Design a protein around this ligand. Sequence first.
Ligand code: CHL
Ligand code: CHL
Ligand code: CHL
Ligand code: CLA
Ligand code: CLA
Ligand SMILES: CC1=C[C@H](O)CC(C)(C)[C@H]1/C=C/C(C)=C/C=C/C(C)=C/C=C/C=C(C)/C=C/C=C(C)/C=C/C1=C(C)C[C@H](O)CC1(C)C
Ligand SMILES: CC1=C[C@H](O)CC(C)(C)[C@H]1/C=C/C(C)=C/C=C/C(C)=C/C=C/C=C(C)/C=C/C=C(C)/C=C/C1=C(C)C[C@H](O)CC1(C)C
Lengths: 219, 221, 183
Amino acid sequence: EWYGPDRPKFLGPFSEGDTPAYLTGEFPGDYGWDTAGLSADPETFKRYRELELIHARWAMLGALGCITPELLAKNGIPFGEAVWFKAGAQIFAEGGLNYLGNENLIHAQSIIATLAFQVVVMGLAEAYRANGGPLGEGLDPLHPGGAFDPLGLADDPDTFAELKVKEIKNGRLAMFSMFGFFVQAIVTGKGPIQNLDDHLANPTAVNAFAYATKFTPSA
Amino acid sequence: TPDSFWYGPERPLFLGAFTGEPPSYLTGEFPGDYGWDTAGLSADPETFKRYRELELIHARWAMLGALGCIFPELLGSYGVPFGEAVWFKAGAQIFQEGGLDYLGNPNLVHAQSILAILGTQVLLMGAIEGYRVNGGPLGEGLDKLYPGGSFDPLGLADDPDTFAELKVKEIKNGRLAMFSMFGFFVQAIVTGKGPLQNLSDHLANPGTNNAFAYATKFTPQ
Amino acid sequence: RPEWLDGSLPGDRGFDPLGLSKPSEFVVIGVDENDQNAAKNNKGSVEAIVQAGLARFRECELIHGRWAMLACLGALVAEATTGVSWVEAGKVELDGASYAGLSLPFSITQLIWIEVILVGGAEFYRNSETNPEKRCYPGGVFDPLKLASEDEERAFRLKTAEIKHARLAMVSFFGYGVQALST
Ligand code: CHL
Ligand code: CHL
Ligand code: CHL
Ligand code: CLA
Ligand code: CLA
Ligand SMILES: CC1=C[C@H](O)CC(C)(C)[C@H]1/C=C/C(C)=C/C=C/C(C)=C/C=C/C=C(C)/C=C/C=C(C)/C=C/C1=C(C)C[C@H](O)CC1(C)C
Ligand SMILES: CC1=C[C@H](O)CC(C)(C)[C@H]1/C=C/C(C)=C/C=C/C(C)=C/C=C/C=C(C)/C=C/C=C(C)/C=C/C1=C(C)C[C@H](O)CC1(C)C
């Protein structure tokens, strides 16, 4: 289970006939889904697993960072804007971007300062991830460990193989939910919890089909 | 490959005479080989098998789609009372008052709920798209693209000389329909009318009702 | 008790008061001469005694009962759900086409053309088979659960279930025929 041919596939019983031969079941999250054939070269397939996991980890920090200012504005905490896709505009406000609501907090004023900080900061860390450096040199670029496993959970590879599967499946949900969040922000214009609440008001009437006539062309 | 004129080294190619030598993996073996792989996307002979079985499924859906987008607008011009005869407005028929009438006829299908349509479709497509992958009632172990048997009841694939000829006709009808269904997409986004309306508007005045009428249409500011 | 039955058959009983499925002998008479250019024309002689359809009769009960089981089960529930008598269908469907209260778009003239193509061609394909056990019991799509892998030729019984229900469904529709015009 989860490795070898005992793994469950992406079509269930329908994928028993045809999975790609190179998707043997020696990597986490392998359900044998390469119907486009984009990874029959194993060097490219080694590159794509890095792309999938880094997209998965940024989507997990994304889907939590998009869900937390809305769930805390529902409690009653005053925010400049709860929704994530209007959450960059607070640095152009009057008082600037306060973190929750206070003034002893961050209190961002200049967008050129906070971006040029990020560019040199993520310029170092992402280059360290591609090469190696002050937190590891010869480590695995997929899963380094050591200083990136402080709590001692990257041990006993029978339960560390399962944590690899728990890593990517939580991520593949989160990537599908950021592209979730991306589309439902464009099509509706309201927040994802704001889309969650009015789907709970009337589920039959308020769904995705209520906005199906929106992008129609008419000149 | 036989001496079938569409196969092998002396086959017609996508720049005619200006094409030179085709790529080394396009040996004239599989149908519709005009030697057009300039991006090199199918240099891997395993991805090239996936792209072949992804082109033809796109081709067979777009051949149904291009016939399926002309036909309600062609009959709609001839007085058949569709709710929306135009294809890209044909989804919104479920949202009007009387529902969705096949052929504009109220005592035909009369769909009222779009969630019943999608719930039926996911169950029925998911059963048969999986049958295309493996097994199934109409054929268990067959070819992935050309299964035949129950999907060739007229026997039009018996002669493998004829069958290799008709596969070229299938892919050229398919690539024409994919290229035209992409035309349906773009010239509905740009113009906003049906493709048979765009045809009859072009035929009424080809000098002004070409695509350069809408060239300044997406101009910024 | 009859002797020409009771074996390899669902209804292994000699019910016959008259023996309709009795294999009878036959004798062939010659053709009488009718040539005028002969002086005398004789009445033909006995030529050939012939030793001699239970397979044909088994098929024909099965077809009638299965149409009856579509008829008896179809007349009780169309009387229940719709609320119209089974004899009245046709008088109310010529006026307005319906199924379970849902209006249908078909003229009554089209129903003749629909039924003689669809039901007719399926009846043209049933007699396109030349094996009397396959004519009675075909395979293929009509056994989707694959019960032909089982056996009923021994004492184990896995077939005599439609044919008893075929019998009284013919009778209960015969009871519908004695009830329609009279009562
Ligand atoms: C046998 C039943 C079964 C079926 C039908 C599926 C189906 C699917 N699984 Mg699988 N699974 C099944 C069993 C199982 N799956 C899984 C575990 C997984 C995982 C982890 C994943 C899948 C995924 C998928 C999808 C991959 C193929 C695809 O992308 O289609 C694409 C085509 C469609 C989905 C059809 C199109 C949608 C719709 C019907 C049309 C609507 C049209 C719109 C209105 C168009 C409008 C657009 C406008 C703008 C033009 C597909 C929906 C993957 C996925 O989620 O990707 C989607 C995925 O990550 N499955 C397990 C546990 C091991 C199963 C157990 O039996
Ligand atoms: C010898 C002359 C000859 C020439 C010049 C071509 C040229 C072409 N053939 Mg070939 N063929 C030729 C002979 C033959 N072809 C074929 C059989 C085929 C087939 C089956 C196919 C082709 C296709 C193609 C195209 C392939 C590459 C491409 O897409 O260009 C890319 C570059 C362009 C298309 C230039 C762009 C045109 C225009 C000037 C730009 C317009 C500018 C817009 C205003 C900008 C838009 C604005 C923005 C903002 C939106 C190309 C147009 C393929 C095709 O149709 O794909 C489209 C194709 O499927 N040919 C046969 C029979 C054997 C030939 C016989 O001699
Ligand atoms: C073949 C797949 C497919 C495509 C291309 C469409 C396309 C469309 N549907 Mg639609 N549908 C499709 C399947 C289905 N639809 C519906 C049910 C509906 C309803 C109820 C409605 C629509 C509407 C629309 C139109 C939205 C207007 C618009 O966005 O303008 C911009 C886009 C275009 C002008 C065309 C460009 C097409 C597209 C961007 C490119 C196609 C490639 C896609 C990215 C592939 C996506 C398919 C995936 C899921 C496999 C749009 C043309 C609405 C409508 O009719 O509004 C007037 C509407 O109300 N659809 C069902 C049943 C659940 C489908 C089943 O598969
Ligand atoms: C729920 C998602 C999830 C899961 C199951 C895993 C699982 C794993 N990761 Mg991955 N990872 C993830 C998300 C996840 N990771 C994300 C989002 C990042 C980016 C920050 C990373 C970055 C990362 C690195 C760099 C490394 C791992 C490693 C590991 C392994 C051991 C550590 C472990 O068991 O953590 C299990 C994790 C959990 C049970 C989640 C706990 C819940 C947290 C606290 C949620 C709260 C988030 C917090 C509020 C936001 C702060 C974010 C901040 C840290 C940036 C194991 C395969 C290490 C490894 O394999 O060593 C060889 C390793 O080197 N991961
Ligand atoms: C890619 C394939 C494709 C797709 C997705 C669509 C999608 C669509 N078509 Mg198009 N169409 C296509 C190909 C396609 N078409 C082709 C190839 C043709 C040419 C034959 C047509 C001709 C066509 C017409 C003429 C109409 C549509 C309509 C529709 C819409 C409703 C679908 C529907 O009613 O299905 C359900 C359809 C069926 C199940 C098949 C038809 C069944 C009819 C009702 C006869 C009933 C069968 C039987 C004789 C009676 C049974 C009796 C019963 C009591 C048991 C939808 C937008 C309708 C619309 O309003 O769009 C504008 C419409 O009227 N289509
Ligand atoms: C598998 C396969 C197979 C075959 O063969 C082929 C194909 C089909 C191609 C394939 C598929 C694929 C896919 C599905 C893909 C997808 C992806 C995604 C979705 C991603 C995302 C991804 C996503 C992501 C990263 C995301 C991220 C995010 C983030 C960071 C966020 C951030 C933020 C926050 C916090 C909040 C604030 O206020 C703002 C912001 C700034 C907004
Ligand atoms: C070859 C090559 C080579 C080099 O190297 C590179 C490159 C260049 C990349 C390449 C190329 C490619 C291409 C050309 C592509 C294209 C494609 C397409 C267009 C597809 C379509 C495709 C398309 C398709 C599928 C389509 C389909 C469709 C359909 C179904 C439809 C449907 C419908 C109908 C009926 C009606 C209604 O009312 C609506 C709807 C719903 C809408």
